[PDB]
Amino acid sequence: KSRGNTYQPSTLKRKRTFGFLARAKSKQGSKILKRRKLKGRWFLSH
Amino acid sequence: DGLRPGDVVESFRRGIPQTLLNEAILSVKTTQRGNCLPISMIPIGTIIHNVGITPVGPGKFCRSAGTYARVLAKLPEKKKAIVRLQSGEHRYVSLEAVATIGVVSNIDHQNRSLGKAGRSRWLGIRPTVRGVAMNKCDHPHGGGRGKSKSNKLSMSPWGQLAKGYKTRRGKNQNRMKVKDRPRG
RNA sequence: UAAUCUUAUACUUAAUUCUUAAGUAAUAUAUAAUAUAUAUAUAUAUUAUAUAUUAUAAGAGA
RNA sequence: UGCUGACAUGAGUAACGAAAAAAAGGUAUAAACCUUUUCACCUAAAACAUAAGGUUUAACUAUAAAAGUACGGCCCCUAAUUAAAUUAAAUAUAAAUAUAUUUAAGAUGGGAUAAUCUAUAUUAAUAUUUAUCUUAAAAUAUAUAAUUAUAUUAUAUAUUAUAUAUUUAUAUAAUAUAAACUAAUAAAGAUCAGGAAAAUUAAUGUAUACCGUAAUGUAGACCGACUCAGGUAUGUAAGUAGAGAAUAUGAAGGUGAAUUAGAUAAUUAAAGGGAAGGAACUCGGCAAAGAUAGCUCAUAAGUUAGUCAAUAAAGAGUAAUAAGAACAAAGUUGUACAACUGUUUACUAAAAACACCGCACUUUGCAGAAACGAUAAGUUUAAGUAUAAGGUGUGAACUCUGCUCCAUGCUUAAUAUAUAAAUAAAAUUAUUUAACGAUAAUUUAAUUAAAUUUAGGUAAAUAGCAGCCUUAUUAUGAGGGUUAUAAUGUAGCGAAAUUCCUUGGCCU
RNA sequence: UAUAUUAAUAAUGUUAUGAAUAAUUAUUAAUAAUAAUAAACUAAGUGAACUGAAACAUCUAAGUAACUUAAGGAUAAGAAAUCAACAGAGAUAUUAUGAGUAUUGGUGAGAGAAAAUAAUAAAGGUCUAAUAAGUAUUAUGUGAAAAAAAUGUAAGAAAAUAGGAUAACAAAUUCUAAGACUAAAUACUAUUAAUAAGUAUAGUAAGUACCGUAAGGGAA
RNA sequence: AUGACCCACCAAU
RNA sequence: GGCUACGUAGCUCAGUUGGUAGAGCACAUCACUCAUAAUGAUGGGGUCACAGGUUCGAAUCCCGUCGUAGCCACCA
- Using C1' positions and the CA of B57, the closest nucleotide is C58
Contacts of B86-92 with CB under 8 Å at 24 or more apart are: B86/B61, B86/B62, B87/B181, B88/B181, B88/B182, B89/B177, B89/B179, B89/B180, B89/B181, B90/B177, B90/B178, B90/B179, B91/B174, B91/B176, B91/B177, B91/B178, B92/B176, B92/B177, B92/B178
Closest to B52 (Cα-Cα) out of B61, B64, B44: B61
Question: What backbone torsions phi and psi does residue B97 show, to the nearest 5 degrees?
Answer: -110, 170
- Beta strand spans in B74-168 (E): 80-84, 90-94, 98-101
Amino acid at B85: L
Q: What's the Å distance between residue B169 CA and nucleotide E17 C1'?
A: 94
Residue-wise burial string across B66-94, b where 16 or more C-beta atoms lie within 10 A, e elsewhere = bbbbbbbebeeeeebbbbbbbeebbbbbb
- Using C1' positions and the CA of A42, the closest nucleotide is E207
Contacts of A4-11 with CB under 8 Å at 24 or more apart are: none
Please answer whether residues B182 and B88 qualify as being in contact, where contact means their C-beta atoms are separated by less than 8 angstroms. yes
Experimental method: cryo-EM
Q: What's the Å distance between residue B22 CA and nucleotide C4 C1'?
A: 48
- Using C1' positions and the CA of A38, the closest nucleotide is E39
Q: What's the Å distance between residue A37 CA and nucleotide E192 C1'?
A: 29
CB atoms under 10 Å from CB of B3, counted, come to 12
Residue-wise burial string across B4-14, b where 16 or more C-beta atoms lie within 10 A, e elsewhere = eeeeeeeebee
Please answer whether residues B98 and B126 qualify as being in contact, where contact means their C-beta atoms are separated by less than 8 angstroms. no
Q: Indicate the resolution in Å.
A: 3.2
Question: CA-CA distance, B163 to B156, in Å (whole number)?
Answer: 10
Please answer whether residues B42 and B72 qualify as being in contact, where contact means their C-beta atoms are separated by less than 8 angstroms. no
- DSSP β-bridge partners for residue B100: B36, B49
Nucleotides of D under 7 A from a protein CB: 52-54, 83-84, 96-97, 192-193, 222-225, 230-231, 339-341, 346-347, 353-359, 361-372, 384-388, 390-396, 408-412, 457-458, 461-463
Question: CA-CA distance, A6 to B161, in Å (whole number)?
Answer: 44
DSSP state of A13: H
Please answer whether residues B46 and B39 qualify as being in contact, where contact means their C-beta atoms are separated by less than 8 angstroms. no
Alpha helices in B49-116 (DSSP H): none
**Beta pairing class for B36-38 and B90-94:** unpaired
Amino acid at B30: T
Q: What's the Å distance between residue A6 CA and nucleotide E166 C1'?
A: 76
CB atoms under 10 Å from CB of B125, counted, come to 11
**Alpha carbon distances (Å) from A23 to A38, B29, B112, B134, B155:** 16, 70, 54, 41, 45
